[PDB]
Amino acid sequence: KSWPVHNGEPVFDVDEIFKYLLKWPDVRQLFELCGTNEKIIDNITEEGRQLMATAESVFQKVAGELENGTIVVGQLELILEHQSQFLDIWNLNRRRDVRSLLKRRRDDLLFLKQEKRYVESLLRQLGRVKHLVQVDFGNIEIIHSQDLSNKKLNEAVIKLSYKRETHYCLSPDIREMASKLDSLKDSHIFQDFWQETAESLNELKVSLPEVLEYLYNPCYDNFYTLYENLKSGKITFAEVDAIFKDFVDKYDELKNDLKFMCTMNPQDQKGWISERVGQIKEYHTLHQAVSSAKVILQVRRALGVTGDFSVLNPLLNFADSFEDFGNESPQFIKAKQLLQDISEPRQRCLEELARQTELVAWLHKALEDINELKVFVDLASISAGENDIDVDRVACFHDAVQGYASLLYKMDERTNFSDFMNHLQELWRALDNDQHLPDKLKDSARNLEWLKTVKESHGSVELSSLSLATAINSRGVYVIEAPKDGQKISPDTVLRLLLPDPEALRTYSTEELKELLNKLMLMSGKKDHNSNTEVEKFSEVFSNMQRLVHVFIKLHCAGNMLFRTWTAKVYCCPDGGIFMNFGLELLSQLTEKGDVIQLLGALCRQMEDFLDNWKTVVAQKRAEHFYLNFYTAEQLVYLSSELRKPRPSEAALMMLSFIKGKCTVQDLVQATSACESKADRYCLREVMKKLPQQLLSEPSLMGKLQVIMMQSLVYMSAFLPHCLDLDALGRCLAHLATMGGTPVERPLPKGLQAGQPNLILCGHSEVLPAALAIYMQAPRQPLPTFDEVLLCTPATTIEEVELLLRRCLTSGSQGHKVYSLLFADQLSYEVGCQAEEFFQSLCTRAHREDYQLVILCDAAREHCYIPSTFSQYKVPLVPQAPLPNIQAYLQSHYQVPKRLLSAATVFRDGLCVGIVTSERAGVGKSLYVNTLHTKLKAKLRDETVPLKIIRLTEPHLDENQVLSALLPFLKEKYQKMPVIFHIDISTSVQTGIPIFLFKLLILQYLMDINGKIWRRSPGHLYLVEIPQPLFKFLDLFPKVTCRPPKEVIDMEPAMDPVEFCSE
């Protein structure tokens, strides 16, 4: 149980076992107890004895290695770490001289490691100046690099004395120079000497024998001469301030460096370091005093006051002159006494005050006294900024003047040295509590522009970042409107914040409110609870208002047709109240005062619960009627709003053409007249009568809102008498569907079952044709549409695929249909997961057990969620019909019949959809379109035919652009006279061509999930260009091609009357 388990008895080596024997203090006692008496070794076990034998053999091997030189150095150092245990075990195992052997071994290991340190130091010295001189280090450059796993025996410990190691030193001379570079490795002056001797060479490959002479020897001779000069004390101050310049007021390390100096030559060190280091310190302090006195004379000249010092003139006279001696002379000590122990710092303080004569002059010009500062800081606070730097500007100014008014305001034009020294002493005492005060003075001085524009500041138009929060808290009205203009419905354009005062008004948007929010979570803190309470209240009211906006758009896009005209004016003021309004003539205003935060949160609670119950009831209504399952929530809202009007918009009728086909307003009113009996009117009247009496039953707005939302949920037509509720919507859609005769019947192909979903893997190039092979097994029938065919794309809304699954699995439909989910693999992980959960739930609840659901996928993309979870329901056929069959099917189904008055008459026997292409461009594609246009103009005189031309030029070809370009073209019915569109496409559109072409041409639809629907009309011509994957897919549609003249002059015309007739 003490073996070194390493995930279960692996050893395959010997070093780990040796470590285990050496370190464990119980192997020692176990071995000693076993060796004392052999009556214990005879009875242990069969495996314990074998492991003991293995450990014994390992220790025997290492012990045998010890006597000779093959013992590895690492295990040797382990023994040098566990000397005691190894000695005891060796003494025990002697029974089956050592102290002298161990002592000699430790001595020779010390020699080895000291040589190792010496060669390391040599490499350090010769690589420190590597950029100046390059050295080839014999063989040691690679011998020192290898780790110490090499064998010991290479250390050649021989007698007849000298011990040669694997580091092949050229001579004992280089060994000694490396040793002395190790002893002097830690001197700054030695570093400077080495650098200055190395720069005396210059890109020269210089070897060690001439490194010793060219580099080391001059350095050492100069070092010796300097050491002798320092011992004598005959040095001059030019060399001193040249070399010791890097020893300013750091004298303990200087003393230690001089000790390292004196250890180089082995002599005594008693009475030389102290006085010489004191002389260096005195010289440094004299230079510092010279600099400080120069700065004082500068401020006396420049600040403005003449003063009278007349004491440092001899010092200045000495400063401009040069003397060459290294001794101390006594006549200046009494003069220097006054600044014997001033400081090393804080001359930065006086020199920063001195170099800024503009600040002091301006402060004396403007302030003139110390009592005005307290008013002045307050006056500057309002003029300052809002962030941390701007707020702390006034604080650093105030602290700077508080710490500098002693030597700034308490001075006389005639001062005596004693009182000036006392004032300076008090100044240092005051500065000691803020050692960054000179920085504060400089930072305030550099803000002289802001600080001169503070007294003369006029009315500044900048309210605050926090007083503005005060304004929002006092009178801010959060106004939700859901504007009805041409703008969108994003959470940015539905919420506004009106701030009154005069009678001017300012309207913050959510973007500007967010900007201010970022501004005032980062603003300074006054350590005052009022600021942070007020900002917290603003942030929370805005957060609950943002979440109300979130829920409101969630409910609008989920489709409520009752909150379309909802509006709310929250008064954030304490006990201001929240004021709701519905866009109706029968619903009163709902207002309640009190705390805004908690009651707003409760209101959002009821709003979200109403949203949940609304999703539940809309799901039930769709599961019942099955024709609210052709439009998602936004299209349902549009239809409901536009159905009650006497004339529905042409967009609504074109959308409804997907349920009925050739929809008309007369049929729409005929259906909507039979979708409600007088019992419904009586019920709504009863609700209207009972409603106010139950409203008056609750004091708070919570209960009244709850009851009003429950009544809108159950009985909605009473609330909004200009938009159909989901139930009336379903009745209208179902009656229109039943009125539409000849239901379509599409049978599933062979090998695909009409009661279980059919997953097919075909490959990206065959998904579109194979799906077609599913749909032409019932010829002479109209093509499918966005219903029953979902050309799925990356990031498709879960609601659309849920809608497809719903129309697949609801019983009341009047016709069997095949529902193909194409390219199901590019759906997102989450969209696919929710679609799968939705399919499971919807087949759990109820459906018709005859649905023909097919799921076509990319054969190379089985790794995603939907196909991986769909492996069991796979049909291993991959249906496919011959390509000419697809061509003939699409061509004869694109044929616009006669007596239709279409543009397609100009085409080849009326295909109404065509692709003009060429392998190389610049050939006549657009010219062919224009010649078809003029050929159509030749017929149908009084043409006035428009030619819309959408330029699709973007990467990741997008549907909404083409839909928006199409939208204002055929919602009017006056251009139902034959129209020639012209879709034009660029050569940077590689990633959207096939899905878009199949959607527009085959599916005959283009839909905005939150917008109207375009249906390709059977009778209006289309001409989509295409540049030249797509090569095969292009062939399905009826395609007419044009080739350059050199390619059309051998098989064939390729000419046009218009270009030739022009001059």
**What residues are designated binding site?**
922-927, 1025, 1054, 1056
Residue 130 within binding range of other proteins, rule CB under 8 A: yes
Binders of other proteins: how many residues, by CB under 8 A?
80
Residue 1056 within binding range of ligand ATP, rule CB under 6 A: yes
Name which position in 669, 846, 921, 1054 contacts other proteins (CB under 8 A). 921
Residue 16 within binding range of other proteins, rule CB under 8 A: no
Burial class of 630 by CB neighbour count within 10 A (0 to 12, 13 to 18, 19+): buried
Name which position in 213, 449, 850, 972 contacts other proteins (CB under 8 A). 449
The minimum distance between CB 363 and other proteins, in angstroms, equals 17
What is the rounded CA–CA span in Å between residue 834 and residue 821?
Answer: 15
The minimum distance between CB 542 and other proteins, in angstroms, equals 8
Residue 793 within binding range of other proteins, rule CB under 8 A: no
- Give Cβ neighbours of residue 450 (< 8 Å, ≥ 6 apart): 383, 384, 393
The minimum distance between CB 992 and ligand ATP, in angstroms, equals 17
Q: Which of residues 531-550 bind other proteins (CB under 8 A)?
A: 539-540, 542-544, 546-547, 550
Q: Using the 8-state DSSP alphabet, how is residue 457 labeled? A: -
| Minimum CB distance to other proteins smaller for 82 or for 848 | 82
847 binds, among other proteins, ligand ATP, Mg ion, none (CB under 5 to 8 A by kind): none
Binders of ligand ATP: how many residues, by CB under 6 A?
11
- Long-range contact set of residues 197-200: C-beta below 8 Å, sequence gap at least 24: 197/222, 198/129, 198/132, 198/133, 199/132
Residue 124 within binding range of other proteins, rule CB under 8 A: yes
The minimum distance between CB 1059 and ligand ATP, in angstroms, equals 4
The minimum distance between CB 74 and other proteins, in angstroms, equals 10
542 binds, among other proteins, ligand ATP, Mg ion, none (CB under 5 to 8 A by kind): other proteins
Q: Which of residues 930-959 bind other proteins (CB under 8 A)?
A: 955-956
Residue 145 within binding range of other proteins, rule CB under 8 A: yes
Residue 921 within binding range of ligand ATP, rule CB under 6 A: yes
| Minimum CB distance to ligand ATP smaller for 382 or for 947 | 947
What is the rounded CA–CA span in Å between residue 1021 and residue 409?
Answer: 93
The minimum distance between CB 1056 and ligand ATP, in angstroms, equals 6
What is the rounded CA–CA span in Å between residue 933 and residue 926?
Answer: 10
The minimum distance between CB 327 and other proteins, in angstroms, equals 26
- Give Cβ neighbours of residue 777 (< 8 Å, ≥ 6 apart): 746, 747, 748, 749
Q: Using CB under 8 A as the criterion, what x/- string covers residues 579-608 for binding other proteins?
A: ------------------xx--x--xx--x
- Long-range contact set of residues 589-595: C-beta below 8 Å, sequence gap at least 24: 590/701, 590/704, 590/705, 590/708, 591/701, 592/700, 592/701
The minimum distance between CB 961 and Mg ion, in angstroms, equals 16
Contact criterion met (CB below 8 Å) for 735 and 806: no
| Minimum CB distance to other proteins smaller for 516 or for 659 | 516
Name which position in 517, 791, 970, 993 contacts other proteins (CB under 8 A). 517
Written as six digits, the tokens of 649 are 């918009």
- Give Cβ neighbours of residue 243 (< 8 Å, ≥ 6 apart): 189, 192
- Give Cβ neighbours of residue 451 (< 8 Å, ≥ 6 apart): 380, 397, 444
Stretch near other proteins under the rule CB under 8 A, chosen from 6-14, 128-136, 213-221, 234-242: 128-136
Contact criterion met (CB below 8 Å) for 358 and 448: yes
- At 1014, give phi and psi (nearest 5°): -105, 135
What is the rounded CA–CA span in Å between residue 575 and residue 577?
Answer: 6
Residue 862 within binding range of Mg ion, rule CB under 5 A: no
Residue 71 within binding range of ligand ATP, rule CB under 6 A: no
Angle at 315 between CA 310 and CA 317, to 5 degrees: 95
- At 506, give phi and psi (nearest 5°): -120, 135
Residue 259 within binding range of other proteins, rule CB under 8 A: no
Stretch near other proteins under the rule CB under 8 A, chosen from 292-300, 389-397, 673-681, 1046-1054: 389-397
Q: Which of residues 999-1038 bind ligand ATP (CB under 6 A)?
A: 1027
List strand residue ranges (DSSP E) for 920-1010, in order.
949-952, 982-985, 1005-1007
The minimum distance between CB 790 and Mg ion, in angstroms, equals 30
Known binding-site residues for ATP equal: 922-927, 1025, 1054, 1056
What is the rounded CA–CA span in Å between residue 784 and residue 852?
Answer: 14
Q: Using CB under 5 A as the criterion, what x/- string covers residues 962-991 for binding Mg ion?
A: ----------------------x-------
Residue 954 within binding range of ligand ATP, rule CB under 6 A: no
Q: Which of residues 1002-1031 bind Mg ion (CB under 5 A)?
A: 1025
What is the rounded CA–CA span in Å between residue 135 and residue 198?
Answer: 12
| Minimum CB distance to ligand ATP smaller for 830 or for 1059 | 1059
The minimum distance between CB 928 and Mg ion, in angstroms, equals 10
Stretch near other proteins under the rule CB under 8 A, chosen from 118-126, 676-684, 773-781, 879-887: 118-126
Q: Using the 8-state DSSP alphabet, how is residue 134 labeled? A: B
Assign residue 1021 a region (left: φ > 0; alpha: ψ between -120 and 50; beta: otherwise): beta
| Minimum CB distance to Mg ion smaller for 370 or for 921 | 921
Residue 923 within binding range of ligand ATP, rule CB under 6 A: yes
How far, in whole angstroms, is CA 872 from its chain's centroid?
Answer: 40
How many CB atoms are located within 10 Å of the residue 953 CB? 13
Tell me which residue of 760, 750, 751, 753 sits closest to 871, measured CA to CA. Answer: 760
Q: Is the dihedral angle over the CA atoms 825, 829, 835, 839 positive or is it negative?
A: positive
Which positions touch Mg ion (CB under 5 A)?
Answer: 984, 1025
Which positions touch ligand ATP (CB under 6 A)?
Answer: 921-927, 1027, 1054, 1056, 1059
